[PDB]
Amino acid sequence: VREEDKLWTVKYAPTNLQQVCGNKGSVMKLKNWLANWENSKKNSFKHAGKDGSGVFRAAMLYGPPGIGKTTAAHLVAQELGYDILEQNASDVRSKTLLNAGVKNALDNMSVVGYFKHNEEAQNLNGKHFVIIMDEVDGMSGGGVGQLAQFCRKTSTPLILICNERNLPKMRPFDRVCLDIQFRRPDANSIKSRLMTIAIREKFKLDPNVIDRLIQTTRGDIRQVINLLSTISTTTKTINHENINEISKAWEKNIALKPFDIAHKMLDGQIYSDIGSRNFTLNDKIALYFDDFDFTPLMIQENYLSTRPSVLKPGQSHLEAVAEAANCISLGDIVEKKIRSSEQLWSLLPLHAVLSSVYPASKVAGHMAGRINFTAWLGQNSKSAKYYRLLQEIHYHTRLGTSTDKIGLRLDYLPTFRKRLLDPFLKQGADAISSVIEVMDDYYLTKEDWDSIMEFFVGPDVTTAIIKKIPATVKSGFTRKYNSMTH
């Protein structure tokens, strides 16, 4: 055992909930939830509380790193006399091993708690489990699906801790469990802690530089503690005389997300005469290099949804948008050449400049609305889902149509609509005899009739006309089709 060898972050860790600086409301809500979990379990979790918290069995912790998520989750379980079961990224987590190891500890009792203390009546929940799943983001080895399935068939407090909530892999956690958001604390919460540390270590700290220390490391208090500890070995006076070097040498190089990268590259402040030397082009290309999978899509999605501020004299908004789109097309050509054969990966920075930097710089200004999510990822999936159905229909009709999968969609389907659907509108339920004698000719079925109607666009929209015909003819057509043999 030793007291000095500690890492300055475990000797000063909060040992009680009244020491967690910042986000009082979130930790208070979580404490009330963990306290009323038993009362909500008595009502089978089917009665929402004052804040609507008793209807959720599992808790979710998300926020920027280094704020006290794990610390709060440990202290709230230690204060109520519970027992702490903690699984983390180092342990192997998969649907098999998760259903093997912790599934049995989901509805069982504690074996070590029974020997802890039972002579005095402290609390009735000193024999139960609180399973803390930490760092849910890292599931490189049933990472999110099985854990989300644990949120419904649970019988013990289930606290989950992650870093970023809106990531697509952890979407199932959306409405199956309660979630709370921990924010970056201000400079007023950690100031008392930092001054008390400075008092207990015989080294000066001006109360005026702590705000800059919190600003250079956005929301990681542990980073501030490590910064102070590393510098307090040779310099014991940290004031406004050397704060610039500290703030410049200890910056945080966080990775930017599709929303933030677009918001940054679309800001008209960098491409000005002053900002061009404070945020150089090398940094702009590194911004793309942080995520080369979504940045071009984001830029193509929201390059014309902003109000520029770098418009050259004479050049309007439409011309700038046109040049941005031309460079977008060129970057698309470069990207296709990159991801084609020969695996030309040395052409990446040219794509970074053509697809992202140039169209952004051309329409750089102040964004009017919000950063919209890219739409091409969903449109391509829809196009593929429709192409599958078109190929199926074409290979069903190949015996008689004698036309490619392209010439059928552009030409045949307009007349097939008149032949198939129109008799059901103008003639009613007595045209059921005619329509069938059509589809048996082209080997169609009910599934093909369901798909053919969905292709038409423009004035002819069938997804609304289908709801207009009576339901009795709908129920009779399927029966007539299933009854007769081909």
Binding site: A322, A325, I333
Partner: protein, 348 residues
């Protein structure tokens, strides 16, 4: 109807008599027929003439087809499946189905059918070559094209390659050279009108005069299949009575492109460009080739009369540029939006 009234021999082709005579000439000595490549406008009647020559050189039982399924595997575990339209004398492939795995399909199936031979009874094995039909050869990938070009001369006494395609330009020079090139001109108005007259006297549709068929032929731009289909749709909507006053039924996408051109020529702003991108998304998402969208949009824009000479000239220049860019990319909307922005900047 489209599929019902179709010639099934060379003595029944009723348009382009010169091409029919040339096909009869090529059908005299079957054992010396080289590889063929048909090129011409879309819906000219290329597949029907191909299957008619194939019936003229083989027996009449070539029309009875059957669809089969073949499963291939790439270098990885991704298993692909293709449909083959086989007949006791030939087989038809549509290699354009696979995205970028055509090189595997060609070099596998063509080699497989070239090595071995055909046995069937209809004096147990002795037969002539086997025919492979390739639809939409213009969409073939360059490496697949090289494989197909090389699997032509090695095994020539067994496989005869009869390919068909419109807009023959994306065909490499070796394939263009090592095969015969046959052009299929679209039938004239005086012949498509006779085709329509035969259809209307056979199907017993009530028409007043011959001007309706002339208007249909003029609207179809020369396309026989689209003209027949529009005639059938007009007969269906007009309740078995064709009159001199009938609205020509343009397909839905044509009307969408026309409304798009109206929106373009009316309001030249980025706010209209957003709705233009939305319309292009809705169009591409419903299985419409981007090159056809671009061609229709540009021709309808040139159709607009309120634009002067310089506007139409710059429009056609930008269209040629973005059409060159369209065949060298994958994300087609990325080029279509740029072309729309350029035409908006041009108009004002």
């Amino acid at each position: 109807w489209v599929d019902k009234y179709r010639p099934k021999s060379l003595n029944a082709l009723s348009h382009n008599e010169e091409l029919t005579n040339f096909l009869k000439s090529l059908s005299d000595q079957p054992r010396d027929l080289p590889h063929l490549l048909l090129y011409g406008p879309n819906g000219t009647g290329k597949k029907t003439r191909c299957m008619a020559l194939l019936e003229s050189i083989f027996g009449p039982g070539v029309y009875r087809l059957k669809i089969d399924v073949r499963q291939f595997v790439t270098a990885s575990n991704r298993k692909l499946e293709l449909n083959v339209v086989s007949s006791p004398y030939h087989l038809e492939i549509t290699p354009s189905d696979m995205g970028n795995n055509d090189r595997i399909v060609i070099q596998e199936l063509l080699k497989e059918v070239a090595q071995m031979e055909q046995v069937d009874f209809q004096d147990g094995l002795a037969h002539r070559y086997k025919c492979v039909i390739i639809n939409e050869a213009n969409s073939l990938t360059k490496d697949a094209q090289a494989a197909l070009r090389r699997t032509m001369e090695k095994y020539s006494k067994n496989i005869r390659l009869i390919m068909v395609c419109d807009s023959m330009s994306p065909i490499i020079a070796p394939i263009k050279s090592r095969c015969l090139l046959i052009r299929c001109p679209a039938p004239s108005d005086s012949e498509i009108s006779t085709i329509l007259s035969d259809v209307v006297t056979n199907e017993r549709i009530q028409l007043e005069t011959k001007d309706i068929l002339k208007r249909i032929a003029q609207a179809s731009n020369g396309n026989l299949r689209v003209s027949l289909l529009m005639l059938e749709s007009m007969a269906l909507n007009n309740e078995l009575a064709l009159k001199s006053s009938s609205p020509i039924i343009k397909p839905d996408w044509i009307i969408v492109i026309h409304k798009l051109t109206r929106k373009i020529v009316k309001e030249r702003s980025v706010n209209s460009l957003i709705e233009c991108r939305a319309v292009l998304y809705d169009l591409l998402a419903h299985c419409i080739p981007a090159n056809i969208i671009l061609k229709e949009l540009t021709f309808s824009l040139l159709d607009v009369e309120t634009l002067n000479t310089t506007n139409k000239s710059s429009i056609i220049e930008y269209s040629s540029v973005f059409d060159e860019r369209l065949s060298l990319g994958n994300k087609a909307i990325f080029h279509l939006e740029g072309f729309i922005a350029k035409v908006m900047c041009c108009l004002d």
